Amino acid sequence: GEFEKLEALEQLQSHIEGWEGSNLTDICTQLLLQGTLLKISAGNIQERAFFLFDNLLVYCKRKSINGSLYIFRGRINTEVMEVENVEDGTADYHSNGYTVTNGWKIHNTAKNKWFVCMAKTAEEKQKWLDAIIREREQRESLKLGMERDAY
């Protein structure tokens, strides 16, 4: 049930070193998807481990008894995250001029920051976009349900 999932969140966070900000068990309840993606940001191309929870996207560097597997790099409140598809073959400054396949863009609107994600396969891209949609839908459903109760 919910409580077992919270203990799992605390354990998951314990594998991320250099965590910044509020803890997962205070703001999240579930993991929709985790996976490795290529991230291109501010001219830099870097592979990152991404984790999409309800309300939060986290990305980490993979670490090269010690429980650390990931090094915290960033987090985005999904309420201030936008996503844009990128068509295969696009090559522009967002990808440093490299050709994008299986990619998309993420907008951190709280930082006015954009970056590109690329997956290795089309099916993996589709899993990510589907998970992003599902996280947003679940969050909106819960919010609108509460607002409709209050209104």
Note the residues at the interface with ligand 4IP (CB under 6 A). 39, 41-42, 44, 46, 48, 59, 73-74, 113, 115
User: Which stretches of the chain are DSSP H helices?
Assistant: 2-13, 24-27, 122-150
86-97 exposure pattern, b = at least 16 Cβ within 10 A, e = fewer = beeebeeebbee
Closer residue to ligand 4IP (CB): 42 or 150: 42
For residue 105, the minimal CB distance to ligand 4IP (Å) is 12
* Least separation in angstroms between CB 48 and ligand 4IP: 5
User: Cβ closer to ligand 4IP: 59 or 128?
Assistant: 59
Q: Which is nearer to ligand 4IP, 41 or 55 (CB)?
A: 41
Alpha carbon distance 54, 137 (integer Å): 10
Residue with the CB atom nearest ligand 4IP in the bound state: 41
Distance between CA atoms of residues 143 and 120, nearest Å: 34
